[PDB]
């Protein structure tokens, strides 16, 4: 049997929740492999002394879903010093980090393009909704609620849904724009408070880096009775699709866990082979990095998820 390590950076953040369960399943679908996954409870150190017990395990391959992107040098020293090879995925480290060794590799995304995706969804329904310009200005206010700051998505999204917007010819007023954490209660927090400041009555549009935290801006909108007022989100969780379907969430973007999950097996699987990190797959590997497309999410095309 094949052992091959796994730690998830958290295991009760939204969107790594669905990814951790579909590797589990590649893995069980492959009779000769255990998975020793991990929770590192946000925690690098803890994710530091997990890995050193999984290569004290004998595992040919490490998948690392780090806490602290910085750390894949200290991630890679310990795996280098094994020969074991390690697939980063969802949290992206440093090029520099990636070519420093011949057994690293990673699986993600192309973090703008969700942030272009969810502002060209926002511009289609602005345009089919002219009754969400309350002040008739012909200009979107908005509130933000960002992912962890230098996460690389929330950067990305946050910058990139602007720009699409005002390049489309959107202009936008940032009312109010926060982290949450990528966090739902934290989310329903920053958003009940908004709600209950002086900008209350001029938000038009809720943009979240994700979303977890789009699901607490519903919750608060419902208590203060603005449920009129829309939410974008980015991942199409299987619970954000529900709200979509209700009209509680007017959009998301599916960040796709289940082509991440299999990439990331797929790969560690072939290097734990011996083999060419695609061997047999059709995956696209580009300079040892896998990126996975986005897709936009609304009601017109949410019967094909
Ligand atoms: C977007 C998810 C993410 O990267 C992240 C990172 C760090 C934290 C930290 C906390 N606390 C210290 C409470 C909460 C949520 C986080 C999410
Ligand atoms: O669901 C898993 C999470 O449970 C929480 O109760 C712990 O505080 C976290 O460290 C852990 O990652
Ligand atoms: O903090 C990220 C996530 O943590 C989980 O424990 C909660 O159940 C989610 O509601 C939250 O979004
Ligand atoms: O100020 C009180 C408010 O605090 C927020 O953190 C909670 O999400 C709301 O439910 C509550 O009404
Ligand atoms: O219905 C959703 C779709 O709407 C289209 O207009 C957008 O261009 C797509 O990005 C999105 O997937
Ligand atoms: O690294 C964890 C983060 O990955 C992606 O950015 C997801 O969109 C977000 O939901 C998640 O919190
Ligand atoms: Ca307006």
Same mark, same amino acid.
């Given at each position: 049997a094949t052992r091959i390590g796994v730690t998830i &950076? /958290? &295991? $009760?953040?939204n969107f790594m929740s669905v990814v951790r369960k579909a590797i589990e399943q590649d893995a069980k679908a492959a009779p000769d492999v255990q998975l020793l996954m991990n929770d590192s409870q946000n925690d690098q150190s803890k994710q530091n002394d997990q890995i050193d017990v999984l290569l004290a395990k004998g595992v040919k391959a490490l998948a690392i879903n780090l806490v602290d992107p910085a750390a894949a040098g200290t991630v890679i020293e310990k795996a280098r010093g094994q020969n074991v090879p390690v697939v980063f995925f969802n949290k992206e480290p440093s090029r520099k980090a990636l070519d420093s060794y011949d057994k690293a590799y990673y699986v993600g995304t192309d973090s703008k393009e969700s942030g272009i995706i969810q502002g060209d969804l926002i511009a289609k329904h602005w345009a089919a909704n002219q009754g969400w310009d309350l002040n008739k200005d012909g200009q979107i206010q908005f509130v933000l609620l960002k992912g962890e700051p230098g996460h690389p998505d929330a950067e990305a999204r946050t910058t990139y849904v602007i720009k699409e917007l005002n390049d489309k010819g959107i202009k936008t007023e940032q009312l109010q724009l926060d982290t949450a954490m990528c966090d739902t209660a934290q989310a329903k927090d920053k958003m009940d408070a908004w709600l209950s400041g002086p900008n209350a009555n001029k938000i038009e549009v809720v943009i979240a880096n994700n979303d977890a935290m789009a699901m607490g801006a519903v919750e608060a909108l419902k208590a203060h009775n603005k449920s009129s007022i829309p939410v974008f989100g980015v991942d199409a969780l299987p619970e954000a699709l529900a709200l979509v379907k209700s009209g509680a969430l007017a959009g998301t973007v599916l960040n796709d866990a289940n082509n991440q999950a299999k990439a990331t097996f797929d790969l560690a699987k072939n290097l734990a082979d011996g /083999? #060419? =990190? =695609? $061997? #047999?797959?059709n995956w696209k590997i580009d300079n040892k990095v896998v990126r996975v497309p986005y897709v936009g999410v609304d009601k017109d095309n949410l019967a094909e998820f």
């Open positions: &950076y /958290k &295991y $009760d953040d /083999k #060419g =990190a =695609a $061997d #047999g797959t």
